[PDB]
Design a protein around this ligand. Structure first.
Ligand SMILES: [K+]
Lengths: 262, 262, 261
């Protein structure tokens, strides 16, 4: 349809990005990655933008992950100029400005990966997080596996990765994986309120603090680059497997998959 | 003395390893390390083994740590062919398959190190963890010191390390050090049920995710290698100290140790 | 004429007290020199098996850097050892375990002392935080990079980026600190924690500390680039107009007007 895949708007010193494909549960195709990647670069460049909020349209889904139809059309899913930014033009796209994921609904797979890549997270009551890629014969290749082990206690993170089972918003708050849980429908105002508790502070201070906290130098987190390389390497090999073909196919006939370990 | 030191059983796609020296509280000698190390390597090589559970015989002790009579006889406590696998053929023995410690009783010292080396942990209600070596004149030389600081909040890990005091299974659960606490006597069934929520997933996805989670390349966790070197160097220096003999002599003469800091 | 810190021995424990309660135990050159020396002495002395640090009184553990001393152009570091950093403490690894006995408010520099310590006991009315971002500055004494290691990442970044405080009770719940005790009783509590450590083999405890931090020859290799990054960022930030506006507005009890330069 003749509509923008994601929209951007200003609220004071805040750039609000809304993934706007609610019929597709806010799944990410190339159009989304273009719009979100461009929006982030613009937020980076504009000295008057002091914080960023990303959210999904509607109340059912924050981001369902990569768009399965787009994948089957063999479409490019990444920013066309900057594939190095990774999934949604977002996960490997460091900027100085603080980013807040306003999780308005289900956030499984790529959706959790967006939250993990963000600095701060507010989720609504009915939101949930997880990396169910292992149930599908792939892996969370947009940073999920190596970032979850850093953002949850190791044993709890490994349970989540290895079983592919979801975590409720309430449990994520309890673990310190997210910052706040709010009523469904209110996530954007809650995120803006959090942003305003940051944009009241000295912007160069907030931004310098963000770089120090991450160990970022010239827009690159040095310690993460080998994790990206390892992930890319593991993912590529995985795709050669028959199981990586079987897994998506089974979910596309609602039957259980038959794993061969090859 | 003449039973297999550790026993292996298949349960579906799960290999179940039981340390089987209940009379010695499942303390580890060369025979245990040989059996456990062999079983891990076989689980690695068998493409039909998709998860491993390790446990100890009976309801009193998961693992008492190093066999002290074996140590006093100057015996080799490691796997005879693979001393590099370290304590029990286990703690420095990375395999692609998810490992679950089914902690059936006390797990102080080496017992905690098996738990720390495993991917996931289920404990019985009366189980306890800790690294009491500091009370004797040595350190946790099987990876316990550097892994517990990664698996508990820093200040909480440091208290456990420096005091040598135990942590209950319920507290471990609350911190996210372990995954589940179950009634005494049911830990094996509970670990197998957890394993079933892993072996239902695509095995190559699960194993690739494990490698990415740990940053493992060709069976080595590069980041841990200098931590092992440091641990072994420190441990060696302590073995030679006067205080390292005062510790056990004081526990034998049923008095308080008088430390000399040499 | 007065002494700024008090150093004493209790059994095998060295007890250090910042003693400027009228300045809310803010750190100047005299504090850093005395605190640095005491740590070095605790390191050298084989009978010192643990260290406790506290502030006098019940209002303030440590208010941070002394703003008068700064405005007077004074040196705030140990006179011989700038490399030890804030209070002679935050970049000064020793083999002996250290316990921060947080006797009251501990924002800014005070939270950095807690973060640099091995263990922390706080009174009920204590609070932690890094409000530097509200002043046009940053927590350049290790606070930003250590807080993200010692609290869950999302929770740490909230603290860092909002500059809002955290109560003793929430710090305990997260495992940032080890114990919360009634006001006025932090020193007895810190010494009791210390006695649960000095009962253990001193060489074991100290080797365990080294392994736990990855310290070789008194240096935590992994933290050096983080120090360098912090110093580089701090240095550049001081050149901005906002870095002057922040402390000026605070001194003038008004809201700062940020220019983002
Ligand atoms: K040991």
């Amino acid at each position: 349809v003749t509509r923008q895949a994601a929209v951007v708007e200003r609220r004071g010193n805040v750039a609000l990005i809304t993934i706007d494909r609610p019929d597709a549960r806010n799944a990410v195709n190339g159009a989304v990655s273009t719009a979100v990647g461009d929006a982030l670069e613009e937020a980076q460049r504009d000295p008057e933008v002091w914080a960023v909020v990303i959210t999904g349209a509607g109340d059912k889904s924050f981001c369902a992950g990569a768009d399965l139809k787009a994948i089957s059309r063999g479409e490019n899913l990444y920013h066309a100029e900057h594939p190095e930014w990774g999934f949604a033009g977002y996960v490997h796209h460091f900027i100085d400005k603080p980013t807040i994921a306003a999780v308005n609904g289900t956030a499984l797979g790529g959706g959790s990966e967006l939250a993990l890549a963000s600095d701060l997270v507010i989720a609504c009551e009915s939101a949930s997080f997880g990396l169910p890629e292992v149930k599908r014969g792939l892996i969370a290749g947009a940073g999920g596996v190596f970032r979850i082990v850093e953002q949850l206690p190791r044993k709890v993170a490994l349970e989540l990765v290895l079983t592919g089972e979801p975590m409720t918003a309430s449990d994520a708050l309890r673990w310190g994986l997210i910052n706040e849980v709010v009523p469904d429908g209110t996530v954007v105002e809650a995120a803006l309120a959090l942003a305003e508790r940051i944009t009241c502070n000295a912007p160069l201070s907030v931004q310098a603090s963000k770089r120090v906290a991450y160990g970022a130098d010239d827009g690159i987190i040095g310690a993460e680059e080998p994790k990206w390389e390892r992930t890319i390497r593991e993912f590529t090999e995985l795709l050669k497997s028959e199981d990586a073909k079987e897994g998506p196919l089974a979910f596309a006939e609602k039957r259980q998959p038959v794993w061969k370990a090859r």
